[PDB]
Ligand binder design. Structure first.
Ligand SMILES: OC[C@H]1O[C@@H](O[C@H]2[C@H](O)[C@@H](O)[C@H](O[C@H]3[C@H](O)[C@@H](O)[C@H](O[C@H]4[C@H](O)[C@@H](O)[C@H](O[C@H]5[C@H](O)[C@@H](O)[C@H](O)O[C@@H]5CO)O[C@@H]4CO)O[C@@H]3CO)O[C@@H]2CO)[C@H](O)[C@@H](O)[C@@H]1O
Length: 338
């Protein structure tokens, strides 16, 4: 009745006060993504005590006491003066949506109104403060409250809204109804060579900016795109189109025995070998049994230690899924394995 990988994650990465820590950074930071992944994982493990502890810290330290009053700051850590506090109060929307989804699902599954209430308020503020109408697209999720929108151009992060979460959110009406559709557009239209970019710009009157560019590569952010798609139920009509679009990533992995570290989105040219986390991300994504098993071996033989926040978090999701630790319904709900 425990999720061993999660139990080890708590010991190595989660403080007594409930903050998820990336030890690789000298400021020993906590991110809103980290908190949301901890909430998700706690929920999947049926670990309410940890869910509550992580939620408390999040509200108190990232939201000045309340997720109903503001989106959580994305970055928290040690300052030069020795004080520990928010380092950037801007939000990161991937943490935000995962946080809202976990909360809403915690409310439903544990039958607790307080989680629903916080989840709803959070989701509404997301829609109001980091969702905007873009000419040529309609409603789009910005990667954050500020810094990603100019008068005539926007920058998006395809990895931020998993299609399952998008589907889940539709039950709440506008603008989520539309976002589920524009999210598909973002994912399908910006992968000309079958690789999703970490970041991608859109300009009014011109459209997607898909010429070769520094951040127009499939690396640490984008690797999650393939994982989210693989986590979609077969009965999600969007899944087939997405698997087809991203096939060259599956083909590369099968052929080379590993996922690439970086891929030029405009040319499809690959470089390096991705870390163990990337292999975990492939487990739900790859449909070929043998290829799946090759990645499974790599995760097993190079399982992340205590000095590897990102690999570990990818592993919780990827290997977690490979081990039936959680599943998503056709409506984006958590089907728990408790
Ligand atoms: O140049 C114009 C004007 O202002 C200054 O330039 C601006 C620039 O125009 C803005 O775009 C830029 O905006 C940045 C935000 O201030 C900053 O908060 C945001 O930080 C991101 C961060 O980049 C990103 O890594 C992080 O993502 C997290 C996600 O959860 C996941 O992807 C994963 O977990 O990785 C991380 C950590 O977990 O999110 C944060 C928060 O959204 O980045 C914006 C873009 O860089 O600000 C500049 C300065 O204000 C310029 O200096 C002036 O001269 C000029 O007049």
């Amino acid at each position: 009745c425990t999720w061993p990988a999660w139990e080890q994650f708590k010991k190595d990465y989660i403080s007594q006060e409930g903050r998820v820590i990336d030890p690789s950074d000298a400021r020993k930071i906590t991110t809103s993504q980290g908190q949301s992944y901890g909430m998700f994982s706690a929920l999947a493990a049926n670990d309410r005590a940890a869910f509550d502890n992580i939620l408390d810290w999040t509200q108190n330290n990232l939201a000045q006491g309340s997720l109903k009053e503001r989106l959580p700051a994305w970055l928290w850590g040690k300052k030069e003066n020795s004080k520990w506090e928010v380092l950037d109060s801007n939000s990161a929307s991937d943490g935000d949506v995962w946080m809202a989804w976990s909360l809403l699902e915690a409310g439903r599954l544990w039958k607790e109104q307080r989680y629903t209430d916080i989840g709803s308020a959070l989701l509404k503020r997301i829609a109001r403060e980091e969702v905007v109408t873009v000419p040529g697209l309609g409603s789009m999720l910005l990667p954050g409250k500020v810094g990603f929108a100019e008068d005539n151009s926007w920058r998006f992060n395809p990895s931020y809204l998993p299609p399952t979460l998008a589907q889940y959110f539709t039950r709440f009406g506008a603008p989520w109804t539309t976002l589920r559709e524009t999210n598909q557009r973002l994912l399908l239209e910006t992968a000309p060579k079958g690789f999703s970019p970490d970041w991608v710009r859109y300009e009014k009157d011109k459209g997607w900016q898909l010429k070769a560019e520094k951040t127009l590569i499939s690396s640490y952010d984008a690797i999650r795109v393939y994982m989210w798609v693989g986590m979609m139920p077969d009965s999600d009509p969007q899944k087939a189109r997405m698997l087809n679009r991203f096939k060259p990533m599956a083909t590369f992995t099968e052929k080379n025995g590993y996922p690439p570290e970086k891929v030029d989105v405009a040319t499809g040219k690959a470089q390096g070998k991705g870390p163990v986390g990337f292999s975990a991300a492939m487990l739900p994504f790859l449909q070929n049994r043998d290829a799946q098993a090759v990645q499974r071996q790599r995760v097993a033989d190079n399982f992340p230690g205590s000095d590897a926040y990102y690999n570990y978090v990818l592993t919780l999701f990827g290997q977690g899924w490979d081990q039936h630790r959680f599943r998503f319904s056709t409506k984006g709900e958590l089907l728990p394995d408790w």
